[PDB]
Design a protein around this ligand. Structure first.
Ligand SMILES: CCCCCCCCCCCCCCCCCC(=O)OC[C@H](COP(=O)([O-])OCC(O)COP(=O)([O-])OC[C@@H](COC(=O)CCCCCCCCCCCCCCCCC)OC(=O)CCCCCCCCCCCCCCCCC)OC(=O)CCCCCCCCCCCCCCCCC
Ligand SMILES: CCCCC/C=C/C/C=C/C/C=C\C/C=C\CCCC(=O)O[C@H](COC(=O)CCCCCCCCCCCCCCCCC)COP(=O)(O)O[C@@H]1[C@H](O)[C@H](O)[C@@H](O)[C@H](O)[C@H]1O
Ligand SMILES: CCCCC/C=C/C/C=C/C/C=C\C/C=C\CCCC(=O)O[C@H](COC(=O)CCCCCCCCCCCCCCCCC)COP(=O)(O)O[C@@H]1[C@H](O)[C@H](O)[C@@H](O)[C@H](O)[C@H]1O
Ligand SMILES: CCCCC/C=C/C/C=C/C/C=C\C/C=C\CCCC(=O)O[C@H](COC(=O)CCCCCCCCCCCCCCCCC)COP(=O)(O)O[C@@H]1[C@H](O)[C@H](O)[C@@H](O)[C@H](O)[C@H]1O
Ligand SMILES: CCCCC/C=C/C/C=C\CCCCCCCC(=O)O[C@H](COC(=O)CCCCCCCCCCCCCCC)COP(=O)([O-])OCC[N+](C)(C)C
Ligand SMILES: CCCCCCCCCCCCCCCCCC(=O)OC[C@H](COP(=O)(O)OCCN)OC(=O)CCCCCCCCCCCCCCCCC
Ligand SMILES: CCCCCCCCCCCCCCCCCC(=O)OC[C@H](COP(=O)(O)OCCN)OC(=O)CCCCCCCCCCCCCCCCC
Ligand SMILES: CCCCCCCCCCCCCCCCCC(=O)OC[C@H](COP(=O)(O)OCCN)OC(=O)CCCCCCCCCCCCCCCCC
Ligand SMILES: CCCCCCCCCCCCCCCCCC(=O)OC[C@H](COP(=O)(O)OCCN)OC(=O)CCCCCCCCCCCCCCCCC
Ligand SMILES: CCCCCCCCCCCC(=O)OC[C@H](COP(=O)(O)OCC[N+](C)(C)C)OC(=O)CCCCCCCCCCC
Lengths: 135, 86, 164, 86, 340, 117, 469
């Protein structure tokens, strides 16, 4: 019971080694399904280290979009010490990881955001430019 | 830049000694810069806990080489359900 | 409008005195000289004149033909953008004390004195909190240096203008 | 640091010693980015610093656009040949 | 531990039986809109119809075609059913009254939803019947395209709340339901929830007339049970998303006056009565939505693939980006950026 | 061991139990004619660019939509500043959307009869 | 201006027909010229070597980056002229050189990526700019999808660039893990003495340098350069080199690095020796580019490399543009067009060009002797400044190797002139056709710069002493 949550980190690590079955898969599909399994293991590990919101974002994006594209396309083509956790009360707001990321990304690094807008603009223009034959 | 911002928008875990070290590097010059090497070791120490781990290593090593009993107010581990019991 | 961080005072970017380290967009457009409007007009004329002369030199389809009205309209639009960027840059450079700025210096002194007489803030009141004001300042300070790459302006009434 | 490192190295070796297929190649690219990001995020947590997580978000987005462009390139490559013999 | 078990069994039984009876309710409602009766013979008033179909299908042989990946063909329906049911863990029937009280409840809903295209994407590869392949590619396209609309409406709503806890989003609606200021957004969520669920008129994915049956052409027995169950459970769950994003969830009316008349102190009677009121409000909203799914199925002919893709990417998505621009603009104009 | 994790564990067990009931109770008599794939009763691949293109353009647009999550979770803290930044971000993306519309990216005999007298 | 151009151009190219491509490209050519001339006066900001940190310490602006920026605009102007104007008005050249619909937008976005690489003050900005440039350059490689070789090239490029980008991201994150920082500005002499960052910084440098194709990872890039359309190769072989090299020079993270020393030596040897047995024009030019990238890599081992690097990169950009343009012009006099993406392929196809166009061969001679480094052409002074720097800093053996590599590469530089001044049996008698005025004027301007730049050397050093000191 306590050894479970203790070795939970080491279990995700072992399953990740094992899943990286991706290389040895006879069928590339099967390889893509094992890639999805690896991504779920990654989401599991992310929650354990305290970054669950990232577990959910990974599920949303890499499995929800990137794995979906992968499958679409291929159907179509032929350190032993323990840390002290201490409390203090200086934080009166309900500020989480997502709020802080929004704060810094939209104020301290607005430039990075607009450059990412240009990068996504590229991610739109390019595929159209090379997969479509005009006129 | 986001340097110095913690996961909750405050100051990160290792801000204080970093800010002390910057107070150094502001006051000193290139010739005098070696003058606060100490602030930089403090910063790297907060970051990586290396001398702390070494000190704990020597403490554990000598502790496990001891058969005599220890008479000091001890540390007790309790289940999470048992916080505040009795 | 109290600064949260320490700034240099009357720092010399050039041979002339400093008026404003990060001037507000309204000031930079407000202090523009007739020569700067001449620059805007010259760019606005030059860009379609440029396309027409280019067609003269080396016709696109062998035989000379005047560029269509769509392209000329484009040309005017983009030329005005380039001219305005150039003119804004000239005015801001005056503000930093890099080009000659006697007229702008006097006009600023008068405007600041009038504002002080009225009891208002020298740089106006901001709808942002001071932390967002420092962040806006650190984002807009000397952003005219990247005029070639991206346009960025100061639209925020912050107090970090580098004066006394 | 451990799970991310091993995903990175095993995906790299899968990429290099691929002599089976190009899809394996795409997948090794993606999983390398995964391992990089996991190392990054563990470091972010240990430092209680937001810069690590900000760069993790940016990697996520850029890996998205990179996957989009790469699959578009593969499709354009296929359009001429009809078959991927790797 | 015991209380946790009892809560989970109660919730699970209610959800499974509600899905089972939604099928009967669909048949009966369509029947009465078609001047006929629908199931009224298997069980009193046809109330055991769904269990009859269930038992039959569980006694049916499983056929694994020769060219098929049998593992994938059997596991794809299983994963789609699991995700469809996992989606229910965050749905509240009252303030904090849910199996999972996550501060990232919305993000959980969206993620588990995005795990919903894999049944369609995988079955075509597993069946190998050609009809299944065409259906699978077209479905994957349609589903992802409309998932975009659903995610965009989620974002627009969070613009008003600034929270990813579902209960908080519901509580903010005591002032007004969000379907009042955003009526056009509610219409689009219905049109898109119909499409994302693959229901008529947008049933191109498994339309019998264009393609016999659909991706499920080859699914007999329990795998067919799983696709069926996942489809109706997803209908109810996306009606739930609609309910708490736009219809105020479990909020009906201010019953403070009434409770002060009836009771004079807190008691298990009053807690139960409040629980019943909240749950009844939320369940009546769910019932109106399910009825609307059935109504739209009764009234309209199907779209073509080109038609629905054109819809989503040329009529809906521009409007949603326009709303992305106009909602924060209205917040800024009136100084009403919501606090955390 | 809260309700969340127990429910999450419980669902796949129910799925596997229904599957095992089917395997245990149903007959199983495969033969060649039954194993054939069904295509209207008798035995018996180029695609269009827009098929590729819907899928491929899903990923950038999904990323655009999900890039607004940090914004809507921090709207008040970023005030009228972040507001303007996110307008610029949205307009830049809207430009790419306009390009997509005008190029008609996702979309898939009138001669007269003349006699030489 | 660049962002505004990109936005407008996306709108127009959406709303314009395929026949308007060249007119659009002429429009942008003139726009860039106008920006270069009207906004040049911003140099004045950089007087006394004044440095500015901008965008919340993400971007850094000094005289060096301003100069690199102007140079990149000049290169973009020249390169866009080749697409915006027809050499000849015959059917053959309409088939040979037609601009794709989206090509100009890709060019501008890749230029933006390069400028953001140059100005990058923080590692997040560096990585985003690297990925922006890498993606745009993948697409530019792939936009001519009728070519089998171009598609194969774009795919190989995608994979090699992806691996190098992962190496770069790994280096960035290791630097973060050790220092909890994303800026090199946090580094100081005390910090470098205290901590061993050598491994991390060299991994970052190597990840950047293998993207411009330094040995022993050259061959994939030379193959890509060989297999792309010629007007694409003129671009993709130049801009990434400039951006990456300029960033590395500005950052100075590999001073006296033993590994960079060995790799620069190896790059010189492979670029010089390996280009000898080449028979294809573009492979010859790619090995030229490899040797010159070696010459510039040497400058990453020392401080105060700004003058030598700027002079060398400018003269190299001019010589590279000019030699590609000469190869382009010599197409009109070949008797066999190999295909529509690469009309001329083998060096021997220039044989006897002096009998068809004497002054084209004069220009060719001038550019070749610049590459060899014959004074008083620009190439000589570029090599002279580089030797001055490296000998001032005690790189004796590397100087000897540089001598030897220049000697060896002179052989396959003169191969071109050798076959060009030989004699061809069928000699042009007459022609009504006129080469386009604009491109001929541009080629002439480049040639005159290479020939008579040295008269301004002392004026240039005087200006430099006030803007970079
Ligand atoms: C620039 C040209 C267009 C100008 C439009 C109007 C200008 C104006 O008069 O402002 C008055 C306006 C009101 O004046 P005021 O009442 O006297 O207030 C006095 C103080 O401003 C009060 O300041 P404050 O501190 O009290 O308040 C904080 C400040 C908040 O201010 C900020 O936080 C701004 C910070 C963001 C910096 C943006 C710089 C532009 C970046 C361009 C893209 C870069 C991408 C890089 C990629 C690589 O003000 C606000 O709260 C306003 C919030 C937003 C207003 C509505 C948003 C409109 C966005 C779209 C407008 C479209 C215009 C029509 C089409 C053109 O001032 C504003 O602050 C509004 C914001 C200005 C518009 C932002 C972006 C404009 C368009 C983008 C630039 C395009 C470049 C084209 C030319 C390129 C070179 C040739
Ligand atoms: C709720 C359900 C209520 C109905 C309960 C039972 C009625 C349905 C029972 C039923 O049709 O299986 C009959 C057996 O018939 C009995 O006599 C076998 C004994 C019947 C077992 C009764 C269990 C009742 C509760 C189950 C839970 C047909 O299997 P069968 O002879 O081909 O025998 C087997 C069996 O089908 C497969 O598990 C094997 O894999 C296969 O090799 C096959 O040969
Ligand atoms: C996508 C792929 C993704 C894959 C990820 C997995 C790989 C992760 C690690 C690989 C990263 C990338 C590898 C890059 C190549 C590594 C080579 C490398 O960095 O240059 C070396 C590393 O000098 C070590 O002292 C370092 C020594 C090397 C470490 C020891 C070897 C351990 C192997 C044990 C068996 C840097 O010294 P350097 O040139 O400054 O050399 C000198 C010298 O070090 C100083 O004394 C002088 O003062 C200084 O002026 C300088 O001149
Ligand atoms: C410090 C280094 C920085 C810059 C140095 C580079 C260049 C020098 C600066 C500015 C260069 C500006 C030069 C403008 C004056 C040049 C000039 O006579 O017109 C053009 C070239 O015109 C450009 O093609 C103008 C294109 C400008 C691009 C040049 C940039 C290289 C050449 O006349 P041209 O007799 O052949 O032109 C004739 C005539 O115009 C037509 O009517 C005839 O029908 C036709 O047969 C044609 O031959
Ligand atoms: C009316 C505006 C037109 C200006 C357009 C400029 C376009 C640049 C395009 C290509 C670069 C091409 C050659 C650049 C010249 C360097 C200027 C300079 O002096 O270099 C210094 C720094 O020296 C260095 O590190 C070394 C530079 C290496 C040059 C190698 C070539 C030497 C031979 C060229 C001879 C010049 C031809 C004259 C023929 C009559 C930067 O000077 P600066 O930063 O103060 O800016 C100058 C003031 N400006 C903005 C108004 C123009
Ligand atoms: C262990 C590694 C991963 C670590 C933990 C998993 C993380 C979560 C997983 C999420 C589920 C989605 C993806 C599932 C992985 C896909 C498995 C797979 O690859 O199945 C296909 C493959 C077919 O290969 P095949 O042709 O039969 O090989 C013949 C060799 N003689 O079949 C095989 O290769 C072998 C048979 C696999 C059977 C899969 C059984 C599990 C099905 C999913 C259950 C999910 C949980 C519910 C509380
Ligand atoms: C695991 C795979 C993917 C995980 C998705 C993350 C979902 C999530 O958000 O978990 C959050 C939740 C606790 O989060 P929180 O909202 O802060 O709870 C406060 C309640 N007052 O978490 C919970 O309530 C329960 C945790 C559920 C996941 C536990 C799985 C352990 C993973 C290790 C697998 C070992 C192999
Ligand atoms: C498709 C299905 C559409 C059905 C939508 C039902 C709309 C009616 C319920 C609106 C609920 C709401 O958000 O506000 C109701 C709220 C009730 O007030 P109260 O119970 O006293 O609580 C006090 C705290 N405010 O406060 C109010 O009473 C405000 C008045 C109700 C909201 C406007 C009613 C007119 C518009 C109804 C049109 C709905 C769509 C058609
Ligand atoms: C949750 C419920 C879990 C129930 C799963 C139990 C499966 C038992 C079925 C079985 O015995 O094997 C069935 C499988 C069918 O595949 P096969 O017969 O080889 O080829 C058919 C092609 N027409 O035959 C196989 O190939 C076996 C593959 C699965 C390996 C499991 C071995 C089971 C042995 C029974 C003891
Ligand atoms: C909520 C549940 C509502 C349904 C219960 C009433 C149906 C009924 O009890 O109906 C009587 C049933 C058999 O129904 P029948 O054989 O079709 O007769 C119907 C008469 N005619 C004319 C309509 C044919 O008798 C039984 O063995 C009841 C045992 C079933 C228990 C499982 C219930 C699961 C929940």
């Amino acid at each position: 019971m306590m050894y479970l949550t203790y070795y939970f980190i080491e279990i995700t690590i072992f399953l990740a080694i094992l899943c990286t079955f991706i290389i040895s898969a006879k069928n590339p599909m099967v390889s893509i399904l094992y890639m999805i399994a690896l991504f779920v293991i990654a989401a599991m590990y992310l929650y354990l280290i305290g970054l669950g919101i990232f577990s959910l974002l990974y599920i949303m994006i890499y499995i929800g979009a990137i794995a979906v594209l992968f499958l679409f396309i291929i159907t179509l083509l032929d350190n032993d010490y323990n840390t002290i956790i201490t409390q203090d009360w200086f934080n009166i707001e309900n500020t989480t990881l997502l709020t802080t990321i929004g704060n810094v990304l939209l104020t301290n690094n607005a430039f990075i955001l607009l450059v990412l807008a240009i990068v996504l603009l590229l991610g739109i223009i390019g595929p159209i430019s090379i997969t479509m034959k005009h006129k | 830049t986001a340097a110095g911002i913690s996961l909750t928008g405050g100051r990160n875990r290792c801000f204080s000694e970093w800010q002390s070290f910057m107070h150094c590097t502001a006051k000193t010059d290139a010739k005098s810069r070696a003058q606060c090497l100490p602030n930089f070791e403090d910063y790297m120490e907060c970051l990586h806990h290396t001398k702390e781990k070494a000190r704990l290593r020597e403490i554990e090593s000598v502790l496990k080489q001891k058969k005599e009993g220890l008479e000091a107010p001890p540390v007790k581990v309790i289940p999470v359900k048992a916080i505040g019991l009795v | 409008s109290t600064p949260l961080v320490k700034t240099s005072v009357n720092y010399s970017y050039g041979d002339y005195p400093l008026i404003d380290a990060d001037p507000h967009f309204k000031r930079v457009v407000g202090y523009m000289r007739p020569s700067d409007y001449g620059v805007i007009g010259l760019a606005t004329a030059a860009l379609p004149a440029g396309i027409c002369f280019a067609e003269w030199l080396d016709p696109v389809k062998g035989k000379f033909a005047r560029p269509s009205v769509k392209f000329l309209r484009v040309a005017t639009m983009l030329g005005f953008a380039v001219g305005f960027g150039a003119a804004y840059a000239r005015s801001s450079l005056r503000f930093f004390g890099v080009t000659e700025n006697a007229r702008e210096y006097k006009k600023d002194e008068a405007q600041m004195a009038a504002r002080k007489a009225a009891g208002l803030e020298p740089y106006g009141t901001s709808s942002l909190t001071p932390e967002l004001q420092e962040i806006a300042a650190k984002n807009s300070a000397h952003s005219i240096a990247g005029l070639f790459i991206f346009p960025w302006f100061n639209f925020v009434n912050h107090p970090y203008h580098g004066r006394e | 640091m451990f799970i991310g490192t091993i995903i990175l190295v095993l995906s790299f070796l899968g990429f290099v010693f691929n002599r089976r297929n190009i899809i394996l190649a795409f997948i090794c690219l993606e999983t390398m980015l995964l391992g990089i990001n996991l190392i990054l995020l563990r470091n972010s947590v240990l430092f209680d610093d937001i810069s690590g997580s900000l760069f993790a978000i940016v990697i996520i987005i850029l890996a998205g656009v990179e996957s989009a462009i790469g699959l578009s390139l593969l499709v354009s490559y296929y359009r001429l040949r009809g078959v991927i013999n790797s | 531990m015991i209380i946790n078990i009892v809560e989970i069994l109660i919730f699970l039984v209610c959800v499974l039986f509600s899905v089972a009876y939604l099928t009967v309710a669909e048949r009966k409602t369509l029947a009465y809109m078609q001047r006929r009766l629908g199931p009224n013979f298997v069980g009193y008033y046809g109330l055991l119809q769904a269990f009859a179909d269930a038992v039959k299908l569980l006694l049916k042989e499983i056929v694994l075609p020769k060219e098929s990946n049998y593992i994938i063909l059997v596991i794809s329906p299983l994963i789609t059913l699991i995700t469809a049911l996992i989606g229910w863990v965050v749905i509240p029937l009252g303030p904090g009254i849910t199996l999972g009280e996550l501060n990232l409840g919305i993000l959980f809903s969206l993620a588990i939803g995005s795990l919903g295209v894999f049944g369609s994407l995988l079955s075509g590869w597993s069946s190998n019947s050609k009809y299944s392949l065409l259906g699978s590619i077209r479905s994957t396209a349609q589903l992802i395209s409309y998932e975009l609309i659903l995610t965009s409406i989620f974002i627009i709503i969070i613009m008003f709340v600034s929270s990813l806890n579902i209960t908080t989003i519901i509580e903010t609606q005591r002032v007004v339901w969000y379907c009042i200021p955003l009526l056009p957004l509610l219409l689009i969520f219905f049109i898109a929830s119909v499409a994302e669920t693959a229901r008529p008129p947008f049933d191109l994915t498994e339309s019998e007339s264009e393609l016999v049956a659909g991706y499920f052409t080859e699914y007999s027995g329990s795998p067919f049970v799983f696709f069926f169950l996942a489809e109706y459970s997803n209908i109810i769950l996306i009606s739930a998303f609609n309910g708490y994003l736009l219809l105020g969830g479990y909020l009906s009316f201010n019953y403070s006056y009434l409770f002060n008349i009836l009771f004079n102190d807190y008691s298990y009677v009053s807690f139960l009565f409040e629980g019943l009121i909240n749950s009844s409000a939320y369940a009546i909203k769910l019932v109106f939505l399910m009825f609307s799914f059935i109504w739209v199925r009764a009234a309209f002919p199907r779209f073509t693939y080109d038609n629905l893709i054109n819809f989503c990417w040329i009529i809906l998505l521009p409007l949603l980006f326009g709303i992305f621009l106009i909602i924060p603009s209205t917040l800024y104009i009136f100084d009403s950026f919501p606090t955390l | 061991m809260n309700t969340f994790i127990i429910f999450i564990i419980l669902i796949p067990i129910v799925g596997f139990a229904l599957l095992a009931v089917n395997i245990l109770l149903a007959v199983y008599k495969p033969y060649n004619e039954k194993l054939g794939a069904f295509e209207c009763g008798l035995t018996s691949l180029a695609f269009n660019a827009a098929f590729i293109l819907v899928a491929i353009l899903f990923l950038p647009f999904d990323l655009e939509i999900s890039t607004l999550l940090p914004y809507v979770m921090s709207i008040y803290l970023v005030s009228n500043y972040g507001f303007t930044i996110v307008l610029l971000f949205l307009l830049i993306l809207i430009i790419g959307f306009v390009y997509e519309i005008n190029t008609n990216a996702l979309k898939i005999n009138t001669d007269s009869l003349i006699y030489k007298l | 201006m660049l962002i505004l151009a990109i936005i407008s151009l996306i709108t127009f190219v959406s709303m314009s027909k395929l026949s308007d491509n060249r007119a659009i490209i002429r429009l942008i050519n003139i726009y860039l010229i106008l920006v270069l001339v009207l906004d040049s006066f911003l140099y004045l900001l950089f007087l006394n070597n004044q440095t500015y940190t901008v965008m919340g310490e993400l971007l850094i602006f000094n005289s060096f980056t301003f100069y690199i920026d102007m140079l990149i605009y000049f290169i973009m102007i020249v390169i866009s002229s080749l697409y915006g104007y027809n050499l000849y008005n015959n059917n053959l050249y309409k088939t040979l050189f037609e601009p794709k619909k989206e090509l100009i937008i890709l060019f501008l976005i890749n230029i933006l990526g390069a400028l953001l690489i140059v100005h990058s003050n923080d590692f997040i900005t560096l990585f985003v700019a690297i990925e922006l440039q890498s993606y745009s350059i993948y697409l530019i490689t792939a936009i001519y999808n009728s070519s089998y070789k171009a598609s194969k090239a774009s795919m190989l490029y995608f994979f090699m660039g992806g691996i190098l980008s992962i190496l770069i991201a790994y280096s960035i994150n290791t630097y973060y893990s050790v220092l909890n920082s994303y800026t090199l500005h946090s580094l100081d002499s005390l910090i470098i003495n205290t901590l061993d960052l050598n491994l991390i910084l060299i991994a970052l440098s190597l990840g950047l340098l293998f993207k411009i194709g330094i040995a022993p990872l050259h061959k994939w890039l030379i193959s890509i350069y060989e297999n792309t359309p010629i007007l694409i190769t003129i671009y993709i072989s130049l801009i990434p080199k400039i951006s990456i090299l300029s960033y590395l020079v500005l950052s100075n993270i590999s001073i006296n690095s033993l590994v960079i020393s060995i790799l620069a030596i190896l790059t010189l040897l492979v670029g010089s020796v390996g280009g000898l047995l080449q028979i294809k024009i573009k492979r010859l030019l790619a090995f030229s580019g490899l040797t010159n990238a070696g010459y510039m890599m040497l400058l990453l081992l020392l401080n105060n490399n700004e003058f030598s690097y700027l002079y060398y990169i400018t003269q190299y950009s001019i010589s590279h543009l000019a030699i590609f343009m000469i190869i382009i012009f010599s197409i009109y006099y070949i008797n066999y067009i190999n295909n529509q993406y690469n009309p001329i392929i083998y060096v021997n196809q220039l044989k006897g060009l002096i009998h068809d166009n004497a002054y084209l061969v004069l220009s060719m001679a001038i550019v070749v002797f610049s590459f060899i480094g014959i004074p008083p052409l620009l190439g000589f002074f570029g090599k002279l400044n580089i030797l001055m720097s490296i000998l001032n800093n005690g790189y004796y053996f590397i100087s000897i190797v540089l001598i030897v590599a220049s000697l060896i590469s002179a052989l396959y530089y003169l191969y071109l002139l050798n076959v060009s001044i030989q004699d061809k049996n069928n000699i042009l008698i007459n022609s009504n056709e006129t080469v386009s005025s604009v491109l001929s004027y541009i080629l002439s301007s480049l040639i005159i710069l290479i020939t008579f730049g040295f008269i301004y050397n002392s004026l240039i050093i005087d200006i430099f002493n006030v803007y970079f000191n």
